[PDB]
Amino acid sequence: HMLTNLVAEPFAKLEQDFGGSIGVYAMDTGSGATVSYRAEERFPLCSSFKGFLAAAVLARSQQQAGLLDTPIRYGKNALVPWSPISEKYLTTGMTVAELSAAAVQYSDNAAANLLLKELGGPAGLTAFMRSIGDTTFRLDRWELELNSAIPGDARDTSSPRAVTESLQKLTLGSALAAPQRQQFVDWLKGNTTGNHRIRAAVPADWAVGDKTGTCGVYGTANDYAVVWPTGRAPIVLAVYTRAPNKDDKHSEAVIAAAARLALEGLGVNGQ
């Protein structure tokens, strides 16, 4: 309460210029100060669920030794659009760990669906999120159907706040054992799809890991990240967007701009 939005930032003008809605939740893990704008509204996850998917696989690997090393062979029928890594290993297979890295770092859709199957589908990932205390997250469908981003549809959504809270538990808290926690961080740090989103607001000499999402309709796209500014405690944040019309385009620049405002609102000296 008293540490939320100590310093107001012009999020309303930003979303109005964008032509839609922006949801932001950012937490300074040192002081607990927060920046919050539409933070409890639902937004479509799009590919951003794939970070939590990888975390769920890591959690399972704590009880199933050798899970990560398991080789997975798949057929051409598994190769749904935008599977840039798994298409290169169709004739060989990939390990569970490699599928998880591809899902996180390249948003690989075939990899994501293969890992969802390992967990028992969308309900199995939802169950993992419930097990860490997230009552907001819901995954309902598979790739690519989960990208429909229909206004008012709660399927395949979460809130910026719940995304940030869960991300903090998994990357900095105790939801994963220490080796698995660092592996999750390392996968997020190696993401290749986020250079124009939260990372564009983060100075080059700070460490950062992130996971993006882009639905392709309804101006719907997002990013969440852990950021390690030097000399102070890490920041966790989530930035989600949507817009009213199916053919409204998303904007990476708006996500970066919202992240800049969040860091400014937390008093973190950055760019």
Side-chain angles (χ1 to χ4, degrees):
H1 34 96
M2 59 177 300
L3 297 179
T4 303
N5 297 328
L6 294 164
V7 172
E9 300 292 345
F11 291 113
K13 183 58 168 187
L14 185 66
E15 76 187 348
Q16 287 159 22
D17 287 347
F18 169 62
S21 299
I22 302 167
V24 177
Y25 197 78
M27 172 125 61
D28 185 336
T29 69
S31 66
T34 58
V35 168
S36 181
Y37 186 82
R38 300 189 186 281
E40 300 84 20
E41 295 186 30
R42 287 184 173 284
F43 293 77
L45 288 160
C46 319
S47 288
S48 76
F49 84 92
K50 296 166 186 164
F52 296 120
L53 179 64
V57 169
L58 288 166
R60 185 182 285 257
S61 80
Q62 296 173 198
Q63 293 312 313
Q64 293 184 22
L67 172 61
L68 293 187
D69 282 352
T70 296
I72 305 297
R73 292 179 287 122
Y74 47 90
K76 190 176 176 177
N77 64 333
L79 290 179
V80 292
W82 187 259
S83 296
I85 307 299
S86 55
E87 69 186 10
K88 295 161 178 56
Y89 298 85
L90 174 63
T91 54
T92 66
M94 299 173 53
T95 67
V96 167
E98 290 176 324
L99 291 170
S100 297
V104 173
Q105 301 176 329
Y106 294 85
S107 291
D108 191 292
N109 279 318
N113 281 346
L114 289 163
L115 294 171
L116 273 176
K117 189 179 150 283
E118 198 63 59
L119 298 181
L125 181 54
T126 300
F128 171 71
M129 297 298 284
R130 294 289 177 278
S131 83
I132 70 171
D134 185 329
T135 55
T136 307
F137 179 99
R138 56 185 292 182
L139 204 73
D140 296 78
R141 290 173 293 169
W142 302 72
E143 287 284 7
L144 302 169
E145 291 85 5
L146 65 79
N147 297 295
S148 54
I150 293 165
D153 185 357
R155 290 180 298 173
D156 309 295
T157 65
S158 195
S159 68
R161 178 167 183 167
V163 168
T164 293
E165 289 170 340
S166 288
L167 183 63
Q168 175 172 357
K169 290 165 178 178
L170 292 165
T171 59
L172 300 171
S174 64
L176 297 172
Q180 283 74 16
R181 179 182 324 138
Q182 187 64 50
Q183 180 64 89
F184 185 42
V185 164
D186 288 350
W187 283 337
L188 293 167
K189 286 182 170 193
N191 181 35
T192 75
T193 69
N195 294 341
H196 304 291
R197 296 183 189 192
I198 294 168
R199 282 168 188 267
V202 173
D205 69 315
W206 299 0
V208 45
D210 84 295
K211 179 75 203 75
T212 60
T214 308
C215 279
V217 287
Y218 290 104
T220 293
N222 55 63
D223 196 23
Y224 58 73
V226 188
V227 176
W228 287 266
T230 67
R232 62 184 296 158
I235 309 303
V236 187
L237 72 163
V239 179
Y240 282 67
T241 78
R242 68 180 129 71
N245 303 312
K246 190 170 180 180
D247 73 348
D248 284 339
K249 298 301 148 172
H250 74 273
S251 169
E252 302 201 282
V254 166
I255 294 169
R260 287 196 197 91
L261 292 183
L263 293 171
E264 292 175 343
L266 293 175
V268 176
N269 186 59
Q271 302 178 334

